[PDB]
Lysine-specific demethylase 4D (Homo sapiens), 331 residues
Amino acid sequence: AQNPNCNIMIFHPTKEEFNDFDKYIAYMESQGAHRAGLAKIIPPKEWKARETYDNISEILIATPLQQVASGRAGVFTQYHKKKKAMTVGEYRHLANSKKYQTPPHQNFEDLERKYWKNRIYNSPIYGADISGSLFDENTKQWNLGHLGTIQDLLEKECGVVIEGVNTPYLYFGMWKTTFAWHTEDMDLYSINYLHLGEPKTWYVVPPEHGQRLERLARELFPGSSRGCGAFLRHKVALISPTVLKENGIPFNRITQEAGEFMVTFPYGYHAGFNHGFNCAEAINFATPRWIDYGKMASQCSCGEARVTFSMDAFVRILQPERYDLWKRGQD
Ligand SMILES: O=C(O)CNC(=O)C(=O)O
Ligand SMILES: [Mg+2]
Ligand code: NI
Ligand SMILES: [Zn+2]
């Protein structure tokens, strides 16, 4: 079995190997990359996403989200308070202000220590979940707006044509902005490109051990767990590396820098934080190997998770027994 310890693998494809996206994902899996739940891909030196980032300041962040924490430093939830619209130039100035800017630090490990010590005492503002793309239309390799769609993959594997679309999303971050522990909708893959700015630190649980994280989460968030049998779908719970280690939960960590891709694999729980002002692009995708994960994915039906239009067909076709309950939670 390749990668039996489930380490995060880093890949350096050549420009030739960068042509065929599906083929390279399959290659990484042949080497055991998916066992970690997360892989890093460093593009060949010849590649670029676009020419420059000098002209992005007029993008609008219609609903910036202030991420307010509750709990203790290593075990907390966050809620999202909606703020007034602002441009990317305005948001960048805010991120760099004395109130929000990254503190002085020695290295990534020192900043990680500071994050986990102090995160709860601040409420950073995240420009998350903005439909759009920063890839140039002329970029032919690993362009996240030109990937094969998940509806086409389902149709190719299973023969059923379905409605829905699959487009990317932009994320503008600042120091301490946080993504809570989650797997993707329908336990899909994700791919995330860090276009510019400061790093993003990731934590990940191997897919074969995801249920260990779920059991800990039920213990640590006992009210939330009574409320919903899949409350990590709400995407609000944080647990620190120290608490994971105290409870024997297998996990790994890595820091993504500008110009690098990360891939999350089906049922790979992940969480993390941004180091300072940055911009990432991400999208979900599928492969043949996903279909069995999609069929078995948990679902939230309590009302909280509320998701896109395109998840309806995935539940309907892959999980017909669960469909009526899930759709009620949508309504
Ligand atoms: O960057 C973020 O805030 C969150 N991203 C992801 O969870 C992802 O790419 O799968
Ligand atoms: Mg602009
Ligand atoms: Ni994700
Ligand atoms: Zn729920």
User: Anything to note?
Assistant: DSSP finds ten helices and 16 strands in the chain. The chain has one domain: 1-331.
